[PDB]
Amino acid sequence: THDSSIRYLQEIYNSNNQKIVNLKEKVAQLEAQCQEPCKDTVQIHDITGKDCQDIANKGAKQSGLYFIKPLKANQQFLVYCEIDGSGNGWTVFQKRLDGSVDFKKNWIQYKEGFGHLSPTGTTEFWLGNEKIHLISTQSAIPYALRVELEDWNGRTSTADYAMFKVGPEADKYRLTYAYFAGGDAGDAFDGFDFGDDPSDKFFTSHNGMQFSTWDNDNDKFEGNCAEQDGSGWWMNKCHAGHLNGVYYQGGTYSKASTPNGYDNGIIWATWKTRWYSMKKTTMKIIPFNRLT
Amino acid sequence: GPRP
Amino acid sequence: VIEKVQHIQLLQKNVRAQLVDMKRLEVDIDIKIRSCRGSCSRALAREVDLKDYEDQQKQLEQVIAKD
Amino acid sequence: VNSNIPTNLRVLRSILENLRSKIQKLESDVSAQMEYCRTPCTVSCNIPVVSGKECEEIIRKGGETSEMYLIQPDSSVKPYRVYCDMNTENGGWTVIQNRQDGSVDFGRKWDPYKQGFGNVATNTDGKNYCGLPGEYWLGNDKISQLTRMGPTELLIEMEDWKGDKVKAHYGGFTVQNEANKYQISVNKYRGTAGNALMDGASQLMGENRTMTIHNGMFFSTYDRDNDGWLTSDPRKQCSKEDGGGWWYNRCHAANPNGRYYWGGQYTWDMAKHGTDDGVVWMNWKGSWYSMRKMSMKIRPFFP
Ligand SMILES: *[C@@H]1O[C@H](CO)[C@@H](O[C@@H]2O[C@H](CO)[C@@H](O)[C@H](O)[C@H]2NC(C)=O)[C@H](O)[C@H]1NC(C)=O
Ligand SMILES: [Ca+2]
Ligand SMILES: [Ca+2]
Ligand SMILES: [Ca+2]
Numbered sequence: 001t002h003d004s005s006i007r008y009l010q011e012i013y014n015s016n017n018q019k020i021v022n023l024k025e026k027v028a029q030l031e032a033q034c035q036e037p038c039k040d041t042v043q044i045h046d047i048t049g050k051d052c053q054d055i056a057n058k059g060a061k062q063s064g065l066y067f068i069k070p071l072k073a074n075q076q077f078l079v080y081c082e083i084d085g086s087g088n089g090w091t092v093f094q095k096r097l098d099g100s101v102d103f104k105k106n107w108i109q110y111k112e113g114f115g116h117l118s119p120t121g122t123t124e125f126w127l128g129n130e131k132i133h134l135i136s137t138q139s140a141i142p143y144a145l146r147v148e149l150e151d152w153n154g155r156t157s158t159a160d161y162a163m164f165k166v167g168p169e170a171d172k173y174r175l176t177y178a179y180f181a182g183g184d185a186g187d188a189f190d191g192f193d194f195g196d197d198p199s200d201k202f203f204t205s206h207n208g209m210q211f212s213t214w215d216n217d218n219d220k221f222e223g224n225c226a227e228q229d230g231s232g233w234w235m236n237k238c239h240a241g242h243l244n245g246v247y248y249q250g251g252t253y254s255k256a257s258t259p260n261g262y263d264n265g266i267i268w269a270t271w272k273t274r275w276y277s278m279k280k281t282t283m284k285i286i287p288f289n290r291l292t
Numbered sequence: 293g294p295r296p
Numbered sequence: 297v298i299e300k301v302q303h304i305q306l307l308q309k310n311v312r313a314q315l316v317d318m319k320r321l322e323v324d325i326d327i328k329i330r331s332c333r334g335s336c337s338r339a340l341a342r343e344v345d346l347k348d349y350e351d352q353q354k355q356l357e358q359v360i361a362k363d
Numbered sequence: 364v365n366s367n368i369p370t371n372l373r374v375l376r377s378i379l380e381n382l383r384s385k386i387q388k389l390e391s392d393v394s395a396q397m398e399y400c401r402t403p404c405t406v407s408c409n410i411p412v413v414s415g416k417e418c419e420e421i422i423r424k425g426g427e428t429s430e431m432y433l434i435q436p437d438s439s440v441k442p443y444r445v446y447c448d449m450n451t452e453n454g455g456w457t458v459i460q461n462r463q464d465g466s467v468d469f470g471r472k473w474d475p476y477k478q479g480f481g482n483v484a485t486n487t488d489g490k491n492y493c494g495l496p497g498e499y500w501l502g503n504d505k506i507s508q509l510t511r512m513g514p515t516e517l518l519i520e521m522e523d524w525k526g527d528k529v530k531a532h533y534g535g536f537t538v539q540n541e542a543n544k545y546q547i548s549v550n551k552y553r554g555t556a557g558n559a560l561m562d563g564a565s566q567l568m569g570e571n572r573t574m575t576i577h578n579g580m581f582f583s584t585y586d587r588d589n590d591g592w593l594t595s596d597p598r599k600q601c602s603k604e605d606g607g608g609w610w611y612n613r614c615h616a617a618n619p620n621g622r623y624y625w626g627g628q629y630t631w632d633m634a635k636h637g638t639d640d641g642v643v644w645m646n647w648k649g650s651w652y653s654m655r656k657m658s659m660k661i662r663p664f665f666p
C-alpha cells in the first residue's frame with residue numbers, strides 16, 4: 001500500500017507552497033530598493049544673484065554651479081563660480097585643460113556658449129558672448145579680468161585687466177579694457193614685436209577689437225583670421241593672445257602641424273613663443289573693487 | 293601671429 | 297475499496313497550479329532583478345529556463361488525461 | 364482491481380522535487396541581488412552650457428550632439444534635465460519616455476508618474492558628459508506643460524528582437540493637466556507601425572476594436588482607476604498590480620509602459636495576472652509580443 005507515498009507528496013507540495021509565499025515577500029522587499037535612480041554627482045546650488053561675487057556675499061562658501069541673473073538679463077543661466085576663503089567670488093567664462101572640446105565653432109555657438117559646466121571645474125567650455133556681455137555691463141560697477149595659464153611643466157602665470165567689458169552683438173561683442181593691471185604672463189593683449197615688420201605690434205594688439213568666427217569676419221585682415229587659425233576670438237591681423245585656439249598635446253607644435261601655415265595654438269606671446277600651446281587656460285571676471 |  | 301486515487305487525482309491538480317505559479321514567479325523575479333540595473337551598483341546575470349517548465353508542464357498534462 | 368498505474372504516478376514526485384529545487388535557486392538570486400543593492404549606480408552628467416525652453420530652441424542655439432540638457436520651458440518652472448535627440452529626422456526632439464534594456468521599473472503609482480522617474484542619461488564610454496539615454500518617464504506635469512506651450516508633435520519608435528523597426532508619427536499631441544487627469548489627444552498620424560492610438564488593435568472588429576482606442580482616454584495607474592472599463596467589481600481594472608501607467612480604455616492596443624519581457628514572445632502563464640501587460644504595439648507584432656526598444660519624443664510643430 002502506497003501509505004507514506006501520497007503523504008510525502010503532500011508534505012513537499014504544502015512545503016514549497018509556503019516557501020513560495022515567503023520568497024514573494026522577499027521579492028517585494030527587493031522591488032522597494034530598486035525605485036530610486038542612479039545618484040548624480042553634479043548638483044546645482046540654491047543661492048542665486050547678479051554674479052558670483054553677489055552669491056559669495058550672500059553666504060556661498062564652496063565653488064560650484066549657481067544660477068545668476070544680471071540686471072538686464074531676461075532669463076537666468078547656469079555658471080561656474082570660483083569661491084575662495086577670502087570671500088571673493090569669480091565668474092568664470094572660459095576654460096581649457098585637455099583637448100576634449102572642439103573650439104572651431106560658428107558665430108551662434110560662441111554667442112550662446114558651448115562645452116560643459118562641472119561642479120569640480122574639470123571641464124572645458126565657453127560661456128557665451130551674450131552672457132559675458134550681460135554680466136560685465138549690468139551696472140556701472142567696473143569689472144576686472146584675470147587670465148590664468150599653465151604650461152606643460154606645472155608653471156602658472158596670470159594677466160589682469162581693469163574695466164573689462166564686452167559690448168553687445170550690435171557691435172560684434174567688441175572687447176574693451178582700460179589698462180593692463182600687471183601679472184607675470186605679460187600684457188599680450190598689447191601686441192608683440194615678432195620681427196622685422198615695423199607694425200607687428202599694431203597688428204597683433206587686442207583691446208578694441210571685435211569678435212570673429214569663420215562665418216562672421218570682423219577682423220582687420222583682408223583674409224579671415226578666425227577661419228585660418230580655426231577659432232572664435234577678438235582678431236586683428238591677427239593675434240598675439242589666442243586662448244580659444246587648437247589644443248596641442250604637449251604644447252610644442254610646428255608650422256607643419258597646422259593646415260594653413262600659421263600659429264593656431266593657445267598662445268600668449270609675452271610668456272611663451274607662439275609655437276608653444278598652453279596646457280590649461282582660464283578667463284574670469286570679478287568686480288574691480290574686490291582686488292583693490 | 294602677424295599677417296604680412 | 298481503495299482510498300488513494302481520489303486523493304491523487306486531486307493532488308496532481310494542485311501540482312499543476314503550482315507549476316503555473318512557479319512559472320509566473322520565475323518570470324517576475326527575472327523582470328524585477330533586471331529593474332535594479334538602473335538603481336543598484338550592479339545586477340545579477342541570469343538566464344531563465346522556460347523550456348524546463350514547458351516539458352514538465354506538458355508531461356503532467358499526460359497523467360491528468362487518465363482518470 | 365490491482366495497482367496498475369496508481370504506482371506509476373511517481374512522475375508527480377520528480378515535478379515536486381524539481382520545483383523545490385527551482386525555489387532554492389530563486390531565493391539565492393533574490394538574496395544576491397539584495398546584496399549588490401547596498402550601493403547605488405552613479406552618473407556624472409556635467410551640464411552643457413547651451414540651454415533653452417526645450418530641445419528645438421537648443422538645436423537652433425548650436426547644440427549639435429545628442430545628450431542630456433537642462434531646459435526651462437517657462438520662467439516660473441525650475442530648470443530640469445531631459446534627453447535631447449539631435450539626430451533623428453532633423454533633431455530637436457525632447458525625449459519623454461524610453462525603453463531599451465528593462466533597467467527601470469515602470470509599474471509605479473500615480474505620484475511617481477506625475478513627478479517622473481528613471482534615469483535620464485548615463486555616461487558614455489570615456490567622456491565627461493552623458494550621451495546615452497537611460498530608461499525613464501519624464502513626468503505628467505512636465506509633459507503636460509510642454510505640449511501646451513503651442514502646437515506639438517509626437518514620434519514613437521520601436522524595435523523588435525530581430526533588429527527590425529517601425530515608427531508612429533503623430534503631428535498633433537496634447538496632454539491636459541492633473542485636474543483633467545492628464546487626458547490625451549493625438550492626430551495627424553503617419554508611419555510604419557499601425558495607428559494604434561487613434562484606431563485600436565487592427566486584429567479586432569466592432570466595439571471590440573473601438574474599446575482599444577487611446578485617443579481621448581484619461582491616465583490610469585494601478586492605484587488610481589480612470590480607465591474606460593466602467594464597473595463595480597474592484598478586481599477588474601485595466602492597470603493591475605505592477606502594470607504600467609498609461610491612457611487605458613478597455614484596455615489597450617498599445618502600451619509603451621508595459622512590463623519588459625526579455626526575448627519578445629510571452630504567454631499568459633508568464634504574466635503575473637494572465638493578461639498581456641508587456642511593452643506592446645498590437646498593430647505591428649500582435650498581443651503577446653514585448654518590444655526590445657520603445658521611445659516617445661516630442662517637439663514643436665512650428666505654428
Ligand atoms: C467581440 O467581443 C465579444 C466578447 O468579447 C466576442 O464574442 C463572444 O462574447 C461572449 C461574451 O458574452 C463570449 O462567448 C466570448 O467573449 C466571445 N466568444 C467568441 C466568439 O470567442 C467576439 O468574438 C469579439 N469579436 C471579435 C472576434 O473581435
Ligand atoms: Ca617689429
Ligand atoms: Ca577680414
Ligand atoms: Ca512595481
Ligand SMILES: [Ca+2]
Binds near residue numbers: 592594599601
Ligand atoms: Ca474602472
